[PDB]
Write a protein that binds this DNA or RNA. Structure first.
Ligand SMILES: [Mg+2]
Ligand SMILES: [Mg+2]
Ligand SMILES: [Mg+2]
Ligand SMILES: [Mg+2]
Ligand SMILES: [Mg+2]
Ligand SMILES: [Mg+2]
Ligand SMILES: [Mg+2]
Ligand SMILES: [Mg+2]
Ligand SMILES: [Mg+2]
Ligand SMILES: [Mg+2]
Ligand SMILES: [Mg+2]
Ligand SMILES: [Mg+2]
Ligand SMILES: [Mg+2]
Ligand SMILES: [Mg+2]
Ligand SMILES: [Mg+2]
Ligand SMILES: [Mg+2]
Ligand SMILES: [Mg+2]
Ligand SMILES: [Mg+2]
Ligand SMILES: [Mg+2]
Ligand SMILES: [Mg+2]
Ligand SMILES: [Mg+2]
Ligand SMILES: [Mg+2]
Ligand SMILES: [Mg+2]
Ligand SMILES: [Mg+2]
Ligand SMILES: [Mg+2]
Ligand SMILES: [Mg+2]
Ligand SMILES: [Mg+2]
Ligand SMILES: [Mg+2]
Ligand SMILES: [Mg+2]
Ligand SMILES: [Mg+2]
Ligand SMILES: [Mg+2]
Ligand SMILES: [Mg+2]
Ligand SMILES: [Mg+2]
Ligand SMILES: [Mg+2]
Ligand SMILES: [Mg+2]
Ligand SMILES: [Mg+2]
Ligand SMILES: [Mg+2]
Ligand SMILES: [Mg+2]
Ligand SMILES: [Mg+2]
Ligand SMILES: [Mg+2]
Ligand SMILES: [Mg+2]
Ligand SMILES: [Mg+2]
Ligand SMILES: [Mg+2]
Ligand SMILES: [Mg+2]
Ligand SMILES: [Mg+2]
Ligand SMILES: [Mg+2]
Ligand SMILES: [Mg+2]
Ligand SMILES: [Mg+2]
Ligand SMILES: [Mg+2]
Ligand SMILES: [Mg+2]
Ligand SMILES: [Mg+2]
Ligand SMILES: [Mg+2]
Ligand SMILES: [Mg+2]
Ligand SMILES: [Mg+2]
Ligand SMILES: [Mg+2]
Ligand SMILES: [Mg+2]
Ligand SMILES: [Mg+2]
Ligand SMILES: [Mg+2]
Ligand SMILES: [Mg+2]
Ligand SMILES: [Mg+2]
Ligand SMILES: [Zn+2]
Lengths: 144, 159, 292, 103, 208
RNA sequence: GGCAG
RNA sequence: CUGCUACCA
RNA sequence: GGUUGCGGCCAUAUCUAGCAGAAAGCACCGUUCCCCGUUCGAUCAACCGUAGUUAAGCUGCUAAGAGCAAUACCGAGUAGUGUAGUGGGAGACCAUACGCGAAACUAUUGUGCUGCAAUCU
RNA sequence: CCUAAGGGGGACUCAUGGAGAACAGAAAUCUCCAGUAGAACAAAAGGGUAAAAGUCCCCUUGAUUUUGAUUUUCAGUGUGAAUACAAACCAUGAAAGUGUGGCCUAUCGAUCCUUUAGUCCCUCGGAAUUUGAGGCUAGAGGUGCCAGAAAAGUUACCACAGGGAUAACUGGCUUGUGGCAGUCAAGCGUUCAUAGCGACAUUGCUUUUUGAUUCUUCGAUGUCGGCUCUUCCUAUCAUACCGAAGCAGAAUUCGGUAAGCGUUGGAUUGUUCACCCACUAAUAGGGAACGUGAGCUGGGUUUAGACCGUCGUGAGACAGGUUAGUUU
RNA sequence: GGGUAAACGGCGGGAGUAACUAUGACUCUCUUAAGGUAGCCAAAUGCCUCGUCAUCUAAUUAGUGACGCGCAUGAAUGGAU
RNA sequence: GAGGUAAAGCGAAUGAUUAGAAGUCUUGGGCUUAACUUAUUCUCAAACUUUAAAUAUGUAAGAAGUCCUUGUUGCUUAAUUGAACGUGGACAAUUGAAUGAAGAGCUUUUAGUGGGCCAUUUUUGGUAAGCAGAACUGGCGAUGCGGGAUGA
């Protein structure tokens, strides 16, 4: 529960970008029975940021509808555009921490087409939790 | 009848190590403790004076007082919903310097040396420690190492 | 019929003592009491006067203990005494006194406390402790470490004690173990103590033996006979030696007839070398073959 | 418990302020006076009608008492008090133990 | 007297052996664990057949005794008392307790019986015999199986008799002079220790 | 805890 | 050591 | 490099059975007037270094040595275990998923290192 | 419990085994060797200890004085116990040191009152002296229900507030126990394991026994038995049809489908249970709130009267006997 | 210290034996005293117990008559009639 | 850093325990049995153990830090040694791991409560129990909604 809170996953169908290290991998292992995660493609990142991209501005959830919003909050980190933000996420950049924390947790819908018959078992065993590794893109296409 | 005496349940905790009973080697009495030193607490069963209570067996704290044969150690103990500062008097047989100080103090020295040398060479250096990162790409040569195919083995009884 | 005792389990569970306790050389109880220092006197060391007697030598060392091992401050041996004029009786109580005086004077020269804390310049055998001088450094404090040697009134270790005390070192002690202490009437006979300091007992043995058993006098006191040293001039040998020791207590190492490398090369010739693993395997194979 | 009839402990007397020789005696509680204020109050309360006006202890449990040594300094006659642990038998200056003998 | 074994079938309690803490414990019904020709040499009985537990379970000493008697009777009747060596490989060391022999107050029981705590795959009974006596020894164990609760398997061992060596490694070590008799068991050669004593104890040792 | 045989 | 008498922690 | 005194770690140093040991040291060794202690100058004390000896102590070496220590495509990713399922099974229990992971065993290697002072063929 | 079994110092090494020595032997005393503690350390158990913490010897009172800090239990209150220092004064040892009781973990006690020690200090209030009294600081006398009232019974004549937080029925879970049924097959059965049985073991079912529990009911579900009447179960006593036998017949025993149909009259007992007499095809076993009291009856139990025996000083008790006791 | 039970009340445990078998007529010692006498009884008093024997009946845990080491009958706490 | 539970071990200590074999009886009886001894063998421990996890648990990861120079004291040192606290100087945002942070810290005052119960896993007593008692977490109580027909 604490791990999911520290990942800012405090509701169902909340999504977040995590840079993989030993520390973050050991974090995600604790939350594994409750999450589905994987390796996102560039088009998946772009669709997420374009459709459901919001920034944390003065502790408020603000739509990323103009590059001035991104510049005013991430211009000191050389992020001047939505494509700069997408690039910084995709190629995990020197300012990944600031860019991903500026991004409000993505609030996805339920999958169009549903889950598997039973979610709460590992993807390897025919469920939905754990690491699915490239099928996160298909799942995100379903949910975004 | 319940028994909750001072040394209840310390049958194995306060035992000497196997083949390590008897006299205390004198480096224990030659170590020097200063106020502010971080020390581990480990009760020695053969010295019954100045012995810690079983709660402090295995705890690490700050030296605050130095007396003829003992040190005062500050421990933070959870009592309900907060911590309480405990002040324990321990003979030096039950005390050992904590090894975490020398490692952090070495990273401080190394950072100072690297920063000054990088300034001398006119470049920049990043001193923050990093967690282990996923490994990069690589090419595996198969000269002398052609892949060997394994299969699951049939069931056998070996009794 | 009875159980064999030295089993493999007996050896497995045996806890060997400390190396220097199994050698029968270190009393670790007494060593802990001597060495351990007040924890609020943080890195200030306690200084020990280690006094050890061999069959031929008196060893007196001023030692402080550290984690990597003991460190010698100064050391005086009885075989240095011939330089100062004492060639015979190198294990007297009086030779012990001279060695204690020598180590005291040498330590004080090394420290710089020569003019201050001279000591008892006129040895009359009275019990006395080195008192500090007001508005000056305190006397060098040293504690006596007699090791495994028994505490008896008249023992030679307290001769080294008395010599070092008169030499200016402050060494805490009591006079009830000196020769001449009357245990019934608890006072020290300083006349007999001065006799022992200046070889009076040895001179009295010379005088008493010469007129009773001349043959034994000839065998026991040969060196004195060929040196033409009588009893009446025995005392002066020490009285002069004392003075010379105070005149120049500095250590002069023996000039070495060979270098370190020459000593090592000579000694290495008489040192058997361990068999190689292959060598002992070949020996085993040969013994099997000759067993068929 | 056997305690010798003499003892050298610290004397708190202003003349002494040091270990002096003391004579040891067992403390014996003095007789309760009739003019102590609590005694006077109790007698007034008990007078008249009403019965017993205070409580009387019954449920005795101890089988021993704490022995108190009265140490009198032989120099200045200042007394000191020392309580000992609970002993069923206590003598002062008894015969000392003799180890190494048969029954 | 005795409750049905179902009351004590499962390893629900910690092991409760005889000790200085429980002393008035009765004796196990099984006292004999080796039957048949227990003095036979290793070379006489090469074939080993086991009765193996497929259960984590408790077996009473009464069941151990009954199965031992059943197997012994059948095998001695059909093939002779000296055609096999039967060994019971589980000893009942766990004390069962009975309460009734007030209410739930002070309900700590009294010793009632003894049981062996067996695991899955644990050998219960071993029978070393000749190869030609296989079907007999098997039927002796198959009858003994009825006296036990739970599932047991009859497994033909890969090894020579009661030795830990396979039936081929034993023959190799036998023709190489590395095995000597010790009565009913054997001693194996060691390449460690006193060379002379090792060579003397195994004279036919073809060293390599 | 006081007397007394 | 028996009897009688006495009982604020 | 040997040896002594004082040590640190406290068996890779211990134990058993053999063998060797130049120089110095150490040791055994000689004596009882004196200080001292004993049933016993055996231990302890003192005296000579003079009469003798490396016999022992001590040191090193030897042993498919016992023990100890270390290591490991040894066993074994086994036993155990954190987490999971509306998994199996009447149950006892078991399998699978994401993780952590022994002990015994087996084999090989080793058998004190070292600080201060003094001394020595 | 201990003037040492406390404190200091010193010397020595223990249990046990082997080999030897007059009486002397398995066990007396002497000697050597081995001996990691296999001994001992007041008392439970655990830990600790080998030039010691054990044994013996020498000297001693640190088991002393002053008042703070800390640890455990903990509210971070008290009590108990313990720890490390400060300031004294001592003991011991050549000394370094060690010693603020017992090698460590248990071995103990508030307010009020009394009593003693200390300071000989403060007060007795119109002012004094001397007695007396009261204060201040530290012990002791004790509360073991041990944070600490001053305390005998009975009630079957009984009362009240409540309680299904809790017993005495049914019901529910369980099934040890009770009952019933299997599996294996050592034996029994002239031979012959299995016609009929069946030990040592082992798997079950049942809720017709009794326990275990305490979930429901204490602003009340009428607590024994019998009589009466209906229905249901089957683990079938009889009756129908059959299979098996150590089935010649007759009788009997084992078994299958079967609850369609029946399963009694009496002596004694309140009885359920039991036990006899007799008839019968047979006189099977159970359930339905241990069916059934606005269906009865009221013999028993279980209000109040009374008697006895044992028990109690007694009032009274008895799950012992006895007699009389409103059934809406 | 003495008296007193038609005062309250009490009235027991222990140790051996007869020319088949069975039984035991056959003595002292303790509890603070005496140790249940004459009688009566499975009685409204007996647990075991529906005691045993006889009688009564076809059959009787009922009744009566016997028996009595009587859990725990008994003499104005009145016994037996 | 600490630990002694799971596992493991018993030809390792303690305690328990099955079977032979070879020796000694010289301090057992009638070739024999039984003792011991030696090397082996089967099987065990909540109040056994050499070893020894997983989970859980103590501390640290800087600016109140590190380094350099030299002031005070009645403490401490033979000391010009230290101890503690200081004056002065250098090291600047990669000020020295991650992730998160509807901010942190502090105070006063007062309510109800002090019958609990259930599920997974660990676990004690009991034959067991919709039984009695503990550990961690999550729940019901205090909670509706969709599913398990019905049901804290
Ligand atoms: Mg659709
Ligand atoms: Mg679904
Ligand atoms: Mg430990
Ligand atoms: Mg103590
Ligand atoms: Mg000493
Ligand atoms: Mg009144
Ligand atoms: Mg009056
Ligand atoms: Mg249990
Ligand atoms: Mg003691
Ligand atoms: Mg003593
Ligand atoms: Mg001693
Ligand atoms: Mg407290
Ligand atoms: Mg307290
Ligand atoms: Mg002193
Ligand atoms: Mg002190
Ligand atoms: Mg008062
Ligand atoms: Mg007045
Ligand atoms: Mg008190
Ligand atoms: Mg109370
Ligand atoms: Mg209380
Ligand atoms: Mg009343
Ligand atoms: Mg009543
Ligand atoms: Mg209830
Ligand atoms: Mg049943
Ligand atoms: Mg049954
Ligand atoms: Mg109920
Ligand atoms: Mg009710
Ligand atoms: Mg009603
Ligand atoms: Mg009704
Ligand atoms: Mg049927
Ligand atoms: Mg039929
Ligand atoms: Mg009914
Ligand atoms: Mg009705
Ligand atoms: Mg009615
Ligand atoms: Mg009725
Ligand atoms: Mg009535
Ligand atoms: Mg009437
Ligand atoms: Mg009636
Ligand atoms: Mg009636
Ligand atoms: Mg009678
Ligand atoms: Mg009569
Ligand atoms: Mg009668
Ligand atoms: Mg009659
Ligand atoms: Mg009657
Ligand atoms: Mg009748
Ligand atoms: Mg009638
Ligand atoms: Mg009659
Ligand atoms: Mg009567
Ligand atoms: Mg009567
Ligand atoms: Mg434990
Ligand atoms: Mg285990
Ligand atoms: Mg193990
Ligand atoms: Mg064992
Ligand atoms: Mg309130
Ligand atoms: Mg409250
Ligand atoms: Mg309440
Ligand atoms: Mg509620
Ligand atoms: Mg809910
Ligand atoms: Mg619903
Ligand atoms: Mg359902
Ligand atoms: Zn005085």
């Amino acid at each position: 529960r604490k791990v999911l809170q520290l990942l800012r996953l405090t509701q169902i169908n909340a999504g977040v970008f995590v840079r993989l290290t030993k520390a973050t991998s050991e974090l995600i292992k604790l939350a594994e029975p409750y999450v589905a995660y994987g390796y996102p493609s560039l088009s998946t990142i772009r669709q997420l940021v374009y459709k459901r991209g919001f920034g944390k501005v003065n502790k408020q959830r603000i739509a990323l509808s103009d590059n001035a919003i991104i510049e005013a909050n991430l211009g000191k980190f050389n992020i001047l555009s939505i494509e700069d933000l997408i690039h910084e996420i995709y190629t995990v950049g020197p300012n990944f921490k600031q860019v991903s924390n500026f991004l409000w947790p993505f609030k996805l819908s339920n999958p169009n087409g549903g889950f598997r018959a039973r979610k709460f078992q590992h993807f390897i065993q025919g469920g939905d939790t754990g690491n699915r590794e490239q099928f996160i893109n298909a799942l995100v296409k379903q949910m975004n | 009848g319940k028994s909750r005496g001072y040394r209840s349940g310390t049958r194995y905790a306060f035992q000497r190590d196997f083949k390590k009973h008897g006299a205390i080697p004198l480096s224990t009495y030659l170590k020097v403790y200063k106020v502010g030193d971080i020390v581990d607490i480990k009760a020695n069963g053969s010295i019954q004076k100045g012995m810690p209570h079983k709660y402090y067996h295995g705890k690490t704290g700050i030296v605050y007082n130095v007396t003829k044969s003992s040190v005062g150690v500050i421990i933070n103990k959870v009592v309900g919903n907060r911590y309480i500062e405990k002040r324990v008097n321990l003979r030096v047989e039950h005390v050992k310097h904590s090894a975490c100080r020398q490692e952090f103090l070495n990273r401080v020295k190394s950072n100072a040396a690297k920063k000054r040398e990088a300034k001398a060479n006119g470049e920049t250096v990043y001193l923050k420690r990093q967690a282990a990162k996923p490994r990069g790409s690589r090419i595996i040569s198969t000269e002398g190492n052609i892949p060997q195919t394994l299969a699951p083995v049939a069931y056998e009884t070996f009794i | 019929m009875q159980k064999e005792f030295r089993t493999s389990a007996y050896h497995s569970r045996f806890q060997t003592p400390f190396r220097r306790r199994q050698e029968g050389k270190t009393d670790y109880y007494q060593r802990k009491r001597l060495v351990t220092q007040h924890k609020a006197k943080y890195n200030s060391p306690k200084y020990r006067l280690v006094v050890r007697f061999t069959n031929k030598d008196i060893i007196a060392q001023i030692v402080s203990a550290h984690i990597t091992g003991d460190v010698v401050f100064t050391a005086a041996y009885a075989h240095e005494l011939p330089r100062y004029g004492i060639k015979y009786g190198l294990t007297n109580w009086s030779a012990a006194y001279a060695v204690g005086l020598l180590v005291a004077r040498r330590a004080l020269q090394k420290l710089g406390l020569d003019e201050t804390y001279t000591g008892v310049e006129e040895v009359e055998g009275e019990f006395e402790l080195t008192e500090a001088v007001e508005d000056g450094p305190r006397p060098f404090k040293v504690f006596l470490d007699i090791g495994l040697q028994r505490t008896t009134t008249g023992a030679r270790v307290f001769g080294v004690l008395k010599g070092a005390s008169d030499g200016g070192l402050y060494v805490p002690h009591s006079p009830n173990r000196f020769p001449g202490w009357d245990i019934e009437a608890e006072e020290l006979d300083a006349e007999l103590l001065r006799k022992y300091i200046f070889g009076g007992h040895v001179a009295e043995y010379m005088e008493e033996l010469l007129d009773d058993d001349e043959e034994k006098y000839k065998s026991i006191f040969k060196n004195y006979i060929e040196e033409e040293i009588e009893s009446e001039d025995v005392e002066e040998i020490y009285a002069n030696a004392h003075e010379a020791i105070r005149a120049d207590p500095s250590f002069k190492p023996t000039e070495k007839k060979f270098t370190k490398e020459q000593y090592k090369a000579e000694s290495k010739k008489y040192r058997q070398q361990k068999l190689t693993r292959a060598e002992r395997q070949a020996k085993v194979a040969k013994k099997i073959a000759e067993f068929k | 418990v056997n305690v010798p009839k003499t003892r050298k402990t610290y004397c708190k007397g202003k003349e002494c302020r040091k270990h002096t020789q003391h004579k040891v005696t067992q403390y014996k509680a003095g007789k309760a006076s009739l003019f102590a204020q609590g005694k006077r109050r109790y007698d007034r309360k008990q007078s008249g009608y009403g019965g017993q006006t205070k409580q009387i202890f019954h449920k005795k449990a101890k089988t021993t008492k704490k022995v108190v040594l009265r140490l009198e300094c032989v120099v200045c006659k200042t007394k000191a008090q020392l309580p000992l642990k609970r002993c069923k038998h206590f003598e002062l200056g008894g015969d000392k133990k003799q180890k190494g003998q048969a029954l | 007297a005795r409750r049905p074994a179902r009351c004590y079938r499962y390893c629900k309690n910690k092991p409760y052996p005889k000790s200085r803490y429980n002393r008035a414990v009765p004796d196990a019904k099984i006292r004999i664990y080796d039957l048949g020709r227990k003095k036979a040499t290793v070379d006489e009985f090469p074939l080993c057949i086991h009765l193996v537990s497929n259960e984590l379970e408790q077996l009473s000493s009464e069941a151990l005794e009954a199965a031992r008697i059943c197997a012994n009777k059948y095998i001695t009747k059909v093939s002779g008392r000296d055609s096999f060596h039967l060994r019971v490989r589980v000893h009942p060391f766990h004390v069962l307790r009975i309460n009734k022999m007030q209410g739930m107050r002070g309900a700590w029981g009294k010793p009632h019986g003894l049981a062996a705590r067996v695991s899955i795959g644990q050998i219960i009974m071993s029978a070393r015999t000749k190869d030609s006596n296989k079907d007999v020894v098997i039927e002796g164990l198959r009858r003994a199986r009825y006296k036990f609760p739970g599932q047991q398997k009859i497994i033909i061992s890969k090894k020579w008799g009661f030795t830990p060596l396979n039936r081929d490694e034993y023959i190799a070590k036998k023709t190489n002079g590395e095995v000597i008799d010790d009565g009913a068991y054997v001693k194996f050669l060691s390449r460690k220790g006193n060379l002379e004593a090792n060579l003397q104890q195994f004279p036919n040792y073809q060293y390599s």
